Protein backbone atom coordinates (compact mmCIF):
# COMPACT_ATOMS: atom_id res chain seq x y z
CA UNK A 1 0.00 0.00 0.00
CA UNK A 2 0.41 3.60 -0.73
CA UNK A 3 -0.03 7.11 0.59
CA UNK A 4 -3.37 8.76 0.10
CA UNK A 5 -3.84 12.07 1.91
CA UNK A 6 -6.60 12.10 4.54
CA UNK A 7 -8.08 14.23 7.31
CA UNK A 8 -9.65 13.31 10.67
CA UNK A 9 -12.80 15.24 11.37
CA UNK A 10 -16.51 14.40 11.78
CA UNK A 11 -18.85 15.47 8.96
CA UNK A 12 -22.42 15.22 7.84
CA UNK A 13 -23.51 11.71 8.73
CA UNK A 14 -20.90 9.98 6.67
CA UNK A 15 -18.74 9.42 9.72
CA UNK A 16 -20.80 7.62 12.42
CA UNK A 17 -17.92 5.42 13.62
CA UNK A 18 -16.45 3.22 10.92
CA UNK A 19 -16.99 4.59 7.45
CA UNK A 20 -14.02 5.51 5.26
CA UNK A 21 -14.91 8.53 3.11
CA UNK A 22 -12.70 9.10 0.09
CA UNK A 23 -13.78 11.44 -2.70
CA UNK A 24 -13.94 10.98 -6.46
CA UNK A 25 -10.25 11.55 -7.21
CA UNK A 26 -8.86 8.11 -6.50
CA UNK A 27 -11.76 6.65 -8.47
CA UNK A 28 -10.25 8.70 -11.21
CA UNK A 29 -6.76 8.12 -9.80
CA UNK A 30 -7.02 4.34 -9.92
CA UNK A 31 -5.11 4.37 -6.66
CA UNK A 32 -5.46 0.69 -5.72
CA UNK A 33 -7.19 -1.12 -8.61
CA UNK A 34 -7.69 -4.90 -8.71
CA UNK A 35 -6.81 -7.73 -11.15
CA UNK A 36 -7.73 -11.33 -10.31
CA UNK A 37 -7.70 -14.54 -12.37
CA UNK A 38 -9.65 -17.75 -11.71
CA UNK A 39 -8.80 -20.94 -13.61
CA UNK A 40 -10.82 -23.02 -16.08
CA UNK A 41 -10.65 -26.22 -18.14
CA UNK A 42 -12.37 -28.87 -20.25
CA UNK A 43 -12.28 -32.65 -20.70
CA UNK A 44 -12.75 -35.11 -23.58
CA UNK A 45 -13.88 -38.51 -22.22
CA UNK A 46 -13.76 -41.12 -24.97
CA UNK A 47 -16.83 -43.01 -23.86
CA UNK A 48 -18.88 -46.16 -24.28
CA UNK A 49 -21.59 -44.08 -25.98
CA UNK B 1 -26.03 -33.10 -22.56
CA UNK B 2 -24.73 -34.85 -19.39
CA UNK B 3 -23.38 -38.37 -18.70
CA UNK B 4 -21.19 -40.21 -16.17
CA UNK B 5 -18.23 -42.50 -16.93
CA UNK B 6 -18.59 -46.22 -17.81
CA UNK B 7 -15.61 -48.36 -18.81
CA UNK B 8 -13.83 -50.82 -16.53
CA UNK B 9 -10.03 -50.94 -16.65
CA UNK B 10 -9.32 -54.61 -16.09
CA UNK B 11 -5.66 -54.69 -17.10
CA UNK B 12 -3.22 -51.79 -17.13
CA UNK B 13 -0.20 -51.44 -19.38
CA UNK B 14 1.32 -48.03 -18.79
CA UNK B 15 4.10 -48.21 -21.38
CA UNK B 16 6.57 -48.54 -18.52
CA UNK B 17 9.89 -47.66 -20.17
CA UNK B 18 9.07 -49.36 -23.47
CA UNK B 19 7.46 -52.78 -23.63
CA UNK B 20 4.67 -51.64 -21.31
CA UNK B 21 4.47 -52.96 -17.76
CA UNK B 22 1.04 -54.48 -18.17
CA UNK B 23 -0.86 -55.28 -15.01
CA UNK B 24 -4.39 -56.38 -14.36
CA UNK B 25 -6.77 -54.64 -12.00
CA UNK B 26 -6.10 -56.05 -8.52
CA UNK B 27 -9.51 -55.34 -6.98
CA UNK B 28 -11.31 -56.64 -10.08
CA UNK B 29 -9.49 -59.97 -9.79
CA UNK B 30 -11.78 -62.24 -7.72
CA UNK B 31 -10.44 -64.20 -4.77
CA UNK B 32 -11.94 -66.34 -2.01
CA UNK B 33 -10.87 -66.87 1.59
CA UNK B 34 -10.69 -70.44 2.86
CA UNK B 35 -12.82 -71.02 5.93
CA UNK B 36 -9.97 -71.47 8.38
CA UNK B 37 -12.54 -71.54 11.18
CA UNK B 38 -14.41 -74.35 9.44
CA UNK B 39 -11.02 -75.77 8.50
CA UNK B 40 -10.57 -75.96 12.27
CA UNK B 41 -14.26 -76.79 12.68
CA UNK B 42 -13.97 -80.02 10.73
CA UNK B 43 -11.32 -82.36 12.10
CA UNK B 44 -12.29 -81.83 15.74
CA UNK B 45 -15.93 -82.37 14.78
CA UNK B 46 -17.11 -85.51 16.61
CA UNK B 47 -18.22 -86.55 13.16
CA UNK B 48 -14.59 -86.45 12.09
CA UNK B 49 -16.06 -87.89 8.90
CA UNK B 50 -18.39 -84.91 8.43
CA UNK B 51 -15.69 -82.40 9.31
CA UNK B 52 -12.96 -84.06 7.26
CA UNK B 53 -15.40 -84.16 4.35
Swiss-Prot record, chain A:
Transmembrane segments: none
Protein name in UniProt: DNA-directed RNA polymerase subunit beta
Subunit-structure text: The RNAP catalytic core consists of 2 alpha, 1 beta, 1 beta' and 1 omega subunit. When a sigma factor is associated with the core the holoenzyme is formed, which can initiate transcription. The rRNA transcription and antitermination complex (rrnTAC) consists of RNAP, NusA, NusB, NusE (rpsJ), NusG, SubB, ribosomal protein S4, DNA and precursor rRNA; S4 is more flexible than other subunits. In pull-down experiments interacts with CedA.
Biotechnology section: Co-administration of salinamide and rifampicin or salinamide and myxopyronin suppresses the emergence of resistance to both antibiotics.
Modification note: Acetylated on several lysine residues in the presence of glucose.
Protein family according to the UniProt entry: Belongs to the RNA polymerase beta chain family.
Job of this protein: DNA-dependent RNA polymerase (RNAP) catalyzes the transcription of DNA into RNA using the four ribonucleoside triphosphates as substrates. Resistance to the antibiotics salinamide A, salinamide B, rifampicin, streptolydigin, CBR703, myxopyronin, and lipiarmycin can result from mutations in this protein.
Taxonomic classification: Bacteria, Pseudomonadati, Pseudomonadota, Gammaproteobacteria, Enterobacterales
Amino acid sequence: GQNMRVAFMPWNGYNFEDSILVSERVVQEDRFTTIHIQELACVSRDTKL
Amino acid sequence: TSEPEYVIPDVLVRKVSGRWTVELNADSIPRLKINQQYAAMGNSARNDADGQF
